[PDB]
Design a protein around this nucleic acid. Structure first.
Length: 745
DNA sequence: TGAGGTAGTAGGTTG
């Protein structure tokens, strides 16, 4: 009965064709090939009007209400040339943006009381609500005494239908904004360079990372041929310059990058972005207040968007268009298909397991071998604490958790290690300069038989402790010494241990120390399809082209072993060409040859958000390598979210259920109860391959289940998740480019 | 950093 529905809405009416004052871009100056010029000229025309909507074709610029003037800026000349009512089916995104603009106009006049209104409107894709609906539906706007307003960011996405119907894909998010501005913080004498900055005079052209405060005066002429206020006064945006004084224009223009070119903004227009973590740092109790409000389950999001579409109401400008007040009872009416895939059984050493708990009763599937002997590096003021902790770790690693060496859930000799406190070494470090931690790690290196240090770091809770996790990782990753550090907090847990949370921590940390060496605890008994090998692909963005940093080729259909290969790129400036990918898959093939001796017949490849530009290379190469294969894209961050729908109630979806359109699939992987928010599902589509998507989803969900670094499962698959975690710890690769051991846990 | 969730990120680019 568990039916599923994405966060979207049905339009009641049907839109009509309407007359469009179409404009043609004509090139001006040395900016020929105007296809790049249109994207700026839209916002330019949208700025010369008071955000009247300007639309995009390859040379045609459609507008509901005419800007009768020609334009004078040097990029293009734009003319009136005669209007025409457009078609419906040819203009899908066009009428979608029509629905966007009229939802903007309708919600511009919405308030809760006689004050600043309910929503803040940029006539754009995103909608900010000035107030915020709570679980008691009271719409109380949230505000700290130090600023830092909490607002809902609504990303609407209407799509029209060729029969005139419209579907409103609707998404709700949280936004953190202060009242303090960049001009105000520059009056504060605070250096703001490198801060991620959004602008509020402008629109969606964001992620505008700031560059440098200049000597440059606003009132004096700049590179743009005018004063920076004259940028707005000569346009119709002079209304934003009707609160300035002589003092308000002394200390002035900052530079800011917009992914293509530096800009010059008024600092008044610029505002800092605020993360969850920036607010939690600066104002922790306000974050404690809004902690209930940031995490949103499907009931809360659904009530939010109920109130939102009730605020929308009807649009009498359009053909009496209104939306429904609830989600769909089916995605098949939307154009998807649903279901819940099983999770296949897993297996370790002894055989098929029932859960990820009893793997320690049933032994680890893969062990690196060589009887690693761990050494320990501890803070000197926690000596007996460290002794009890490592004693617990080693005794659970061989016999059991308590003094009562439990075999109710634990088998003997789960990892071949030897630790005599008399023989094997454990040495202390005192807190201080980073040079001391380096001397301690190097002193550890001076001994022999110290393979796989297990150290103890102070807490990240106490900020005034300068805990040496990162220097220990750097020095021990310079060597081939895998590491596993623990907090002094969990060290006190191991010391003051009477309940049975200690076994949970020990399950967790033993999976960690197994993963740091080349050992695999449990793998899949049976996949569905006939794939032989798994290859993971991430993004690097070293250049905005075909950029690719690192691969993690999971060996078998079992997943029974895992290789990762970091192609140490020839010096940066060398081409990012698929010759790199040739090296990658040759390494993959020889790796599968060392593991099996036979060529893998079928390989699925999981790529990240770097686009579908080079499928033909994989085609030609694997055709010459005579091997059928699959390529399935995994996008880790999607705005779209899936809600399990009962009779009328809206719960979070149970894990392992999917939403499927032909070669575009959504599914949920994690299990999140209602107290912790929403599950962020996966965006999954097959670029090229042969298998049905159900087999791919079953394989990739069992591939989210098996994992080497933790007890409970993950959101990401093993492939792109492990590749991305390698892509995080770039300075932490032991530079040999290929290891069976996984440092990055 | 016991581990994992969440939340945060814009759609092929816009002084």
């Amino acid at each position: 009965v568990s039916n599923l529905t994405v966060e979207a809405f049905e339009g009641i009416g049907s839109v009509n064709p309407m007359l469009f004052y179409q404009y043609k871009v004509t090139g001006k100056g040395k900016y020929d090939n105007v296809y790049k010029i249109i994207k700026s000229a839209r916002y330019k025309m949208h700025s010369k009007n008071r955000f009247k909507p300007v639309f995009i074709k390859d040379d045609k610029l459609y507008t509901l209400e005419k800007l009768p003037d020609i334009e004078d800026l040097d990029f293009a000349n734009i003319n009136f040339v005669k209007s025409e009512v457009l078609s419906i089916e040819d203009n899908m995104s066009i009428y979608g943006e029509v629905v966007e603009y009229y939802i903007n106009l309708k919600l511009k006049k919405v308030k809760v009381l006689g004050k600043y209104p309910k929503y803040r409107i940029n006539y754009s894709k995103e909608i900010l609500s000035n107030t915020l609906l709570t679980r008691e539906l009271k719409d109380e706007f949230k505000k700290s005494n130090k600023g830092f307003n909490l607002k809902r960011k609504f990303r609407i996405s209407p799509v029209v239908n060729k029969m005139g119907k419209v579907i409103l894909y609707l998404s709700c998010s949280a936004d953190f904004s202060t009242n303090k501005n960049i001009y105000e913080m520059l009056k504060e004498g605070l250096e703001v360079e490198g801060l991620a900055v959004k602008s509020e005079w402008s629109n969606i052209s964001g992620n505008l990372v700031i560059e440098s405060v200049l000597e440059t005066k606003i009132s004096e002429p700049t590179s743009l041929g005018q004063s920076l206020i004259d940028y707005y006064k000569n346009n119709n945006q002079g209304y934003r310059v009707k609160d300035f004084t002589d003092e308000d224009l002394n200390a002035n223009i900052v530079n800011v990058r917009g992914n293509k070119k530096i800009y010059m903004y008024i600092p008044h227009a610029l505002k800092p972005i605020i993360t969850r973590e920036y607010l939690a740092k600066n104002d922790p109790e306000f974050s404690k207040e809004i902690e209930q409000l940031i995490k949103m389950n499907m009931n809360y999001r659904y009530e939010t968007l109920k109130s939102f579409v009730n605020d929308i109401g009807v649009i009498e400008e359009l053909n009496n268009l209104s939306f429904k007040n609830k989600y769909y009872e089916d995605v098949k009416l939307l154009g998807y298909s649903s279901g819940k895939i099983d999770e296949p059984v897993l297996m370790g050493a002894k055989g098929i397991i029932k859960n990820k708990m009893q793997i320690f009763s049933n032994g680890f599937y893969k062990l690196p071998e060589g009887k690693v002997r761990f050494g320990v590096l501890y803070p000197k003021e926690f000596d007996g604490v460290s002794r009890k902790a490592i004693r617990a770790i080693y005794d659970f690693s061989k016999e059991g958790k308590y003094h009562g060496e439990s075999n109710k859930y634990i088998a003997e000799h789960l990892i071949n290690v030897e630790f005599n406190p008399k023989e094997c070494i454990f040495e202390g470090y005192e807190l201080g300069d980073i040079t001391e931690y380096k001397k301690a790690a190097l002193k550890l290196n001076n001994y022999n038989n110290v393979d796989f240090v297990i150290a103890i770091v102070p807490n990240m809770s106490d900020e005034e402790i300068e805990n040496s996790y990162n220097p220990f990782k750097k020095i021990w990753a310079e060597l081939n010494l895998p590491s596993q550090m623990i907090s002094v907090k969990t060290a006190e847990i191991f010391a003051n241990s009477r309940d049975n949370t200690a076994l949970y921590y020990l399950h967790n940390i033993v999976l960690g120390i197994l993963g740091k060496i080349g050992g695999i605890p449990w793998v899949v008994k049976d996949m569905k399809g006939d794939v032989d090998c798994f290859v993971g692909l991430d993004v690097g963005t070293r250049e905005k082209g075909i950029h690719y940093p690192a691969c993690s080729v999971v060996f078998d259909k079992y997943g029974k072993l895992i290789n990762y290969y970091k192609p140490n790129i020839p010096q940066n400036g060398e081409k990012i060409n698929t010759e790199i990918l040739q090296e990658i898959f040759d390494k993959v093939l020889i790796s599968y040859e060392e593991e099996n001796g036979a060529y893998p017949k079928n390989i699925v490849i999981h790529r990240d958000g770097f686009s579908r530009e080079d499928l033909d290379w994989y085609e030609n190469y694997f055709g010459k390598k005579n091997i059928k294969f699959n390529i399935i894209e995994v996008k880790k961050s999607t705005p779209l979210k899936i809600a399990s729908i009962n009779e009328g109630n809206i719960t979070n979806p149970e894990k392992g259920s999917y939403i499927l359109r032909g070669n575009k699939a959504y599914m949920v992987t994690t299990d999140i109860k209602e107290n912790l928010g929403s599950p962020k599902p996966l965006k999954i589509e097959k670029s090229y391959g042969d298998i049905d998507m159900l087999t791919a989803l079953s394989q990739i969900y069992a591939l989210t289940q098996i994992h080497v670094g933790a007890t409970k499962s993950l959101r990401l698959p093993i492939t792109t998740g492990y590749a991305d975690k390698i892509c995080k710890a770039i300075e932490f690769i032991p530079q040999g480019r290929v290891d069976n051991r996984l440092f990055f846990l």
